[PDB]
C-alpha cells in the first residue's frame, strides 16, 4: 500500500555525489597508476561487481587504499566513477576503448553493452 | 555530451538496500527508545537534513551509535528509514501522525508535505 517519490533515487545519488565532491565521509582511495580517486565503498559496491567482491572480502573490506591493475586507464576509471555517482557517461570516440576495457574489469555490464553498441555502429 | 542510463539511480538505491539487509558495511546504529536500526551514514546524510548535520559535526561524525529524542516513534522511524532506502513510504491512517512528526524531526520536507496533504484531504 506504499506511495513512491519518483525523484527520490536521483536526489539521493546527487547528494552522494555532493558528499564525494566535498570529500565528506569518503572511506577509500582507489589508485590507478599515478592517480588517486576518493570515494565511498558502498557506492562502488552498489555499482560494480569487482568492488562488491573486494569490499565483501573479510581482509580487503578493511583496506583504505585499493590499487587497480596497471593496465587500467585513469581517465577511463574517472569517467566510470563519475557515471557511478551521476548516471551520466562521458563516452567519446577518443575514450570509448579505455571506457569499455575499464567497465569490463569493473564488471559494469550496462556500460560494456552501450560501448559495444557505439563501436558496432562505427563499423 | 554525456549519455545517461535511466535506471542507474534506482538500481544503486536497490543495491544499497540489499547491502543494508545483509548488514554489509553498515557503520552506524540509530537507537529509537528500545529499538536499534543499522544503516549507512552516507545514505542517512543524503536523505535527512538532521543526519547531514550530525555526521558533518567534527565530534559526532565518529560516533557508531546515535540516540534519537525519546519522543520519536520507532515504527515512524522504521518507515522513514525504509523510504530513505527504497523511495517507498508505507503511509497509513494508523501511522501518519507518527510519520509526519518523525519526518519533521529528521528534516525530510517531501515526506512532511505528502503527510500534510493526506491529513488535509481527511478534514
Amino acid at each position: 500500500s506504499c506511495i513512491q517519490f519518483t525523484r527520490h533515487a536521483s536526489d539521493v545519488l546527487l547528494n552522494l555525489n555532493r558528499l564525494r565532491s566535498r570529500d565528506i565521509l569518503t572511506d577509500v582511495v582507489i589508485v590507478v597508476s599515478r592517480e588517486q580517486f576518493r570515494a565511498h565503498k558502498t557506492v562502488l559496491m552498489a555499482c560494480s561487481g569487482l568492488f562488491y567482491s573486494i569490499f565483501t572480502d573479510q581482509l580487503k573490506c578493511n583496506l583504505s587504499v585499493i590499487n587497480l591493475d596497471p593496465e587500467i586507464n585513469p581517465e577511463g576509471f574517472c569517467i566510470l566513477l563519475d557515471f557511478m555517482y551521476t548516471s551520466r557517461l562521458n563516452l567519446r570516440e577518443g575514450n570509448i576503448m579505455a571506457v569499455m576495457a575499464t567497465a569490463m574489469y569493473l564488471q559494469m555490464e550496462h556500460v560494456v553493452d552501450t560501448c559495444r553498441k557505439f563501436i558496432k555502429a562505427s563499423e | 555530451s554525456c549519455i545517461q542510463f535511466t535506471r542507474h539511480a534506482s538500481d544503486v538505491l536497490l543495491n544499497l538496500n540489499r547491502l543494508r539487509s545483509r548488514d554489509i558495511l553498515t557503520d552506524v546504529v540509530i537507537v529509537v527508545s528500545r529499538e536499534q536500526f543499522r544503516a549507512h551514514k552516507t545514505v542517512l546524510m543524503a536523505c535527512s537534513g538532521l543526519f547531514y548535520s550530525i555526521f558533518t559535526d567534527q565530534l559526532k561524525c565518529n560516533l557508531s551509535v546515535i540516540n534519537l529524542d525519546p519522543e520519536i516513534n520507532p515504527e515512524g522511524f522504521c518507515i522513514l528509514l525504509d523510504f530513505m532506502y527504497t523511495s517507498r513510504l508505507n503511509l497509513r491512517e494508523g501511522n501518519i501522525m507518527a510519520v509526519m512528526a518523525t519526518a519533521m524531526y529528521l528534516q525530510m520536507e517531501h515526506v512532511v508535505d505528502t503527510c500534510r496533504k493526506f491529513i488535509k484531504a481527511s478534514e
Binding site: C2, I3, Q4, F5, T6, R7 | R88, L89, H110, T114
Partner: peptide, 5 residues
C-alpha cells in the same frame, strides 16, 4: 512528485 508505484 508522489505516485502509486
Amino acid at each position: 512528485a508522489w505516485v502509486i508505484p
